[PDB]
Design a protein around this ligand. Structure first.
Ligand SMILES: Nc1nc2c(ncn2[C@@H]2O[C@H](COP(=O)(O)OP(=O)(O)OP(=O)(O)O)[C@@H](O)[C@H]2O)c(=O)[nH]1
Ligand SMILES: COc1cc2c(c(OC)c1OC)-c1ccc(OC)c(=O)cc1[C@@H](NC(C)=O)CC2
Ligand SMILES: Nc1nc2c(ncn2[C@@H]2O[C@H](COP(=O)(O)OP(=O)(O)O)[C@@H](O)[C@H]2O)c(=O)[nH]1
Ligand SMILES: [Mg+2]
Lengths: 425, 428, 130
């Protein structure tokens, strides 16, 4: 039945996860009590992918809410859709992770991990045919980063034949909670490279840049940044949630989007960039523009290994095809010649809320190395001076673990460079 | 009796199967419930109640496509045991279709095939419908073809294979699945009819004036061609009366078993009253590359065999006069060791179309089946795409993680290289 | 050992302990095994009051550890603006180069500490020369 199990960990993970649920519930016609009130049968056709059927024609998100900080329970439960979640799916600790990856991965997180897995098991066992897991988290904190990656590795050992998909929020000094963010993110990337099938790189640096460019914000709130995350999350899951020409799940997406196992970090994009009707050529140009990417990398500095594009709304499907082929013909140098027909387009008749037409971009680009280089350079600046190292070693971590994570991220950067320079011999 | 069992594997196989059985019912006068107000007994079994049941098996690794058959217009035509579904698909991965996922349903599928075979008194063999591109269409078909060669050693096996096209919803790994299935099926198939999605797309756009053809539009055209090929097995003519004859008439060299099908006329139902096309006009159209099922240049190739299958108001002397003109005005080069003659079949029933469909009802139609070395161009297109990706080992990890050895990609490509050489050797 | 105690107090931000140890003869310029002084530690960990107290009682503003790191490099790396301004005012070498070839400006820029980048440039930080 192609069910997905959704997990949200830490402060960022729960904030973006709640916004995803509010946005997709609106699209599917599901109110906060779990009742359906829409006008289309297409809204309920694939409802089972994200929602469990409850008593008396009600729908309940297949969602697990995790945090080491107790205050997260309260904020979610007080949100507009707070009541929609199953109360026994809230797995919360009391001490917090103090923005420390080691606390999330080895201490507080290791103590709560079994309780989460019991909830994951209960949801998984009730699925007719589990597609896989979707995890929302930041890489810059302690819980989403440390505990999220511990959870991923434990799920990978218990469900080895199921897809692991993440929506991973990359830290930026432009939007920063602490200077230990490069350590937390590097330690996490190392885990993501090995244990996830596909990761959507949601870069806080790119979110800040979009908000500055579009709303002239030098001081955006997490609400401003999250508007872009929820629009993107809705767009990238369109073909999982809605009936259409496409007969596909997360594995089929991973198969066609990931040519090399480690190179599974996507650069998401979105058009039009609104705030809290464009023509098909305008949507297409905007979708391929550096200014519309949710990862702070210039696509023009690399090459696309693979591209997926999802158009939503009533538009000329002939115009979409012509526009997509035009991008590939006129700008052949930005796509690898050794993966034939590596740009795929899908069209969904249903547009998102407050928009008549939209386009969602999913790029597997070698330019993503710029994001990893940025984190690596900040990691190295901090690690060379051993600043804050006792926070991690005090939790039992060894300095070699830092050196190893550093080397693996640099190996990932060199792998992207190798394919960027590869020729179709 | 001389029964033929049709097997539809994966989405493309099942959907084309739907269009074929819809058209067979209309041709034979069978209603969607199996009732009829017999030469067609080769394809349809008959119950005590007078219900005509297709000798068909439908297999898919995920249930969505077959569920539409189970609840649609023809829900009472097939018995539930003939419609087999798994829970998880092959996710465009040949290795999942063949190894990991396929191994879980193979025995059940063979058990269901055996139940149909037991109802036969003179089983000729099988007609296998599948895509080259899908993980199920590629992987599961090759596993089933391997098992059918062991379990039914003397039986003929023919294929109707959907060849991938960028204009028609292809996927990036489809050139791999195509080469993988071709390699493993080659020694288990007697004759295979490739259907290039781009050729069908081109015909629908050019002749039916459909800008963006749906799977329904494409499949109604494919079923019209498939029916033209299987008519001889369902109406008891004088040409291609048994599955064995397809090999005898079209395949002098066993590995070179891919005949080019050319069909005419394809006319829009929504176009102004036109004077009906003569035998000479529809025959001339058989040598027009635009009417081929597979895109290739036959002037670059040599003919090994050629069959012309007419349907409707077709006088034998008019066919003989049309063929005489073709040996004069046109340059049809046969290989120095082949008879040079054209084999002719005529079925006098007026051609049948789906009521309200895109195709106009015609007085006379023709399907030419020619074994030409020009079809090697379609193998070269797939091989080039395979080569680009394989040189970098792009996507190979997905296959290796699903019970397949990496060496199988090299063994498959070497076999394709030998097949391209077989064509080149015959072509001179 | 008073030296070890003052290094710990400056790192932990124990304002009262720092003043008590210094009254007992604690070496204001004591070093740990890596060459870090109480001023390096107070500058890294954002203890402004301790930075000011150490500077008033003989702390070397431009002391180098074994890797050539000065308190200014560390304050600029971690992003402590007020500490950066206090060190500069007390004569910290704005263009000090550590073993990796980094200056305080380079560290502030890599870590995205824009206000510190501005403050360093205003106090004569040389961008084109290390
Ligand atoms: N002509 C035609 N081609 C089709 C149809 N459905 C799919 N295809 C083609 O078949 C290929 C995809 O293979 P599928 O048959 O859909 O997939 P599958 O065999 O079910 O296998 P998996 O989904 O990978 O498990 C592409 O090249 C499609 O264009 C159809 O109804 N008609
Ligand atoms: C469940 O959602 C999706 C699933 C898939 C695809 C996709 O992008 C259009 C999706 O939407 C984001 C997909 C992606 C990329 C491909 O090539 C790069 C491809 O060959 C093929 C595809 C898909 N197939 C087709 C014909 O589009 C199958 C997998
Ligand atoms: N985009 C976005 N980033 C957030 C949000 N909340 C926190 N962050 C980022 O997440 C990182 C801090 O991790 P956080 O999730 O608060 O910590 P955790 O609770 O220990 O996982 C920093 O990079 C923050 O900028 C949010 O709602 N949206
Ligand atoms: Mg399928």
């Amino acid at each position: 039945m192609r069910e997905i199990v959704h997990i949200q960990a830490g402060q960022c993970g729960n904030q973006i996860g709640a916004k995803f649920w509010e946005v997709i519930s609106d699209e599917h016609g599901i109110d906060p009590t779990g009742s359906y009130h829409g006008d289309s049968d297409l809204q309920l056709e694939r409802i089972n992918v994200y929602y469990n059927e409850a008593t008396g024609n009600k729908y309940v998100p297949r969602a697990i809410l995790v945090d080491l900080e107790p205050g997260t329970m309260d904020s979610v439960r007080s949100g507009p859709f707070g009541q929609i979640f199953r109360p026994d799916n809230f797995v919360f600790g009391q001490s917090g992770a103090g923005n420390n990856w080691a606390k999330g991965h080895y201490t507080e997180g290791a103590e709560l991990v079994d309780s989460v897995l019991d909830v994951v098991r209960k949801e998984s066992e009730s699925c007719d045919c589990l597609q896989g897991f979707q995890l929302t988290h930041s890489l810059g904190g302690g819980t989403g980063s440390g505990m999220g990656t511990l959870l991923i590795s434990k799920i990978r050992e218990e469900y080895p034949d199921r897809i692991m998909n993440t929506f991973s929020v990359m830290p930026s000094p432009k939007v920063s909670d602490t200077v230990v963010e490069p350590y937390n993110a590097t330690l996490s990337v190392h885990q993501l490279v090995e244990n996830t099938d596909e990761t959507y790189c949601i870069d806080n640096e790119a979110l800040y840049d979009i908000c500055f460019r579009t709303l002239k914000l030098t001081t955006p709130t997490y609400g401003d940044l999250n508007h872009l995350v929820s629009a993107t999350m809705s767009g990238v899951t369109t073909c999982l949630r809605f009936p259409g020409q496409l007969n596909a799940d997360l594995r089929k997406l991973a198969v066609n989007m990931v040519p090399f196992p480690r190179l599974h970090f996507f650069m998401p994009g979105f058009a039009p960039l609104t705030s809290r009707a464009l023509t098909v050529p305008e949507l297409t140009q905007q979708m391929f523009d550096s200014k519309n990417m949710m990862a702070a990398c210039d696509p023009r500095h690399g090459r696309y290994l693979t591209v997926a594009a999802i158009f939503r709304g009533r538009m000329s499907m002939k115009e979409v095809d012509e526009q997509m082929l035009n991008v590939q013909n006129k700008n052949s140098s930005y796509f690898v010649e050794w993966i034939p027909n590596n740009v795929k387009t899908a069209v969904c008749d249903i547009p998102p809320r407050g928009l008549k037409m939209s386009a969602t971009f999913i790029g597997n680009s070698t330019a993503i190395q710029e994001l990893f280089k940025r984190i690596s350079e900040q990691f190295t600046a901090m690690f060379r001076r051993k600043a804050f190292l006792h926070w991690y070693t005090g939790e039992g971590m060894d300095e070699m673990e830092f050196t190893e994570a550093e080397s693996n991220m640099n190996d990932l950067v060199s792998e992207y460079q190798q394919y960027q320079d590869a020729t179709a011999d | 009796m001389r029964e033929c069992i049709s097997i539809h594997v994966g989405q493309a196989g099942v959907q084309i199967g739907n269009a074929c059985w819809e058209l067979y019912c209309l041709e034979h006068g069978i209603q969607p419930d199996g009732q009829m107000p017999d030469s067609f007994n080769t394809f349809f079994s008959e119950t005590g109640a007078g219900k005509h049941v297709p000798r068909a098996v439908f297999v898919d690794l995920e249930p969505t496509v077959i569920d539409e058959v189970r609840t649609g217009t023809y829900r009472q035509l097939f018995h539930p045991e003939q419609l087999i579904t798994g829970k998880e698909d092959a996710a465009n991965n040949y290795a999942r279709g063949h190894y990991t996922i396929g191994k879980e349903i193979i025995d059940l599928v063979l058990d269901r095939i055996r139940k149909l075979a037991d109802q036969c008194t003179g089983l000729q063999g099988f007609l296998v419908f599948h895509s080259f591109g899908g993980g199920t269409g590629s992987g599961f078909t090759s596993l089933l073809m391997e098992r059918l060669s062991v379990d039914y050693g003397k039986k003929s096996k023919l294929e109707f294979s959907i060849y991938p096209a960028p204009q028609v919803s292809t996927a990036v790994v489809e050139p791999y699945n195509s080469i993988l299935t071709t390699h493993t099926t080659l020694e288990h198939s007697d004759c295979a009819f490739m259907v290039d999605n781009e050729a069908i797309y081109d015909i629908c756009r050019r002749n039916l004036d459909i800008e963006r053809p749906t799977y329904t539009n494409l499949n109604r055209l494919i079923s019209q061609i498939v029916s033209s090929i299987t008519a001889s097995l369902r109406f008891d003519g004088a040409l291609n009366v048994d599955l064995t004859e397809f090999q005898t008439n079209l395949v002098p060299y066993p590995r070179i078993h891919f005949p080019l099908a050319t069909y005419a006329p394809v006319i829009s139902a929504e176009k102004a009253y036109h004077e009906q096309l003569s035998v000479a006009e529809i025959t001339n159209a058989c040598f027009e590359p635009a009417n081929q099922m597979v895109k290739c240049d036959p002037r670059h190739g040599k003919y090994m065999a050629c069959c012309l299958l007419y349907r409707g108001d077709v006088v034998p002397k008019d066919v003989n006069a049309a063929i005489a003109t073709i040996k004069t005005k046109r340059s049809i080069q046969f290989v120095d060791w082949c008879p040079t003659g054209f084999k002719v079949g005529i079925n006098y029933q007026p051609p049948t179309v789906v009521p309200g469909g895109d195709l106009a009802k015609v007085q006379r139609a023709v399907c030419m089946l020619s074994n030409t070395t020009a079809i090697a161009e379609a193998w070269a297109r797939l091989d080039h795409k395979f080569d680009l990706m394989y040189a970098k080992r792009a996507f190979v990890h997905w296959y290796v993680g699903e019970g397949m050895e990496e060496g199988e990609f090299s063994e498959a490509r070497e076999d394709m290289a030998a097949l391209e050489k077989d064509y080149e050797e015959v072509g001179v | 050992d008073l030296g070890k105690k003052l290094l710990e107090a400056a790192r932990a931000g124990q304002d009262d302990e720092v003043r008590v140890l210094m009254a007992n003869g604690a070496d204001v310029n004591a070093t740990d095994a890596s060459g870090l002084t109480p001023l390096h530690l107070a500058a890294t960990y954002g203890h402004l009051e301790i930075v000011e107290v150490l500077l008033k009682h003989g702390a070397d503003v431009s002391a180098s550890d074994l890797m050539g790191s000065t308190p200014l490099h560390l304050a600029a790396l971690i992003g402590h603006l007020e500490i950066v301004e206090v060190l500069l005012k007390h004569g910290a070498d704005v263009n000090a180069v550590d073993t990796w070839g980094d200056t305080p400006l380079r560290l502030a820029a890599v870590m995205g500490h824009l206000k510190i980048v501005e403050a360093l440039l205003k106090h004569g930080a040389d961008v084109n020369a290390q």
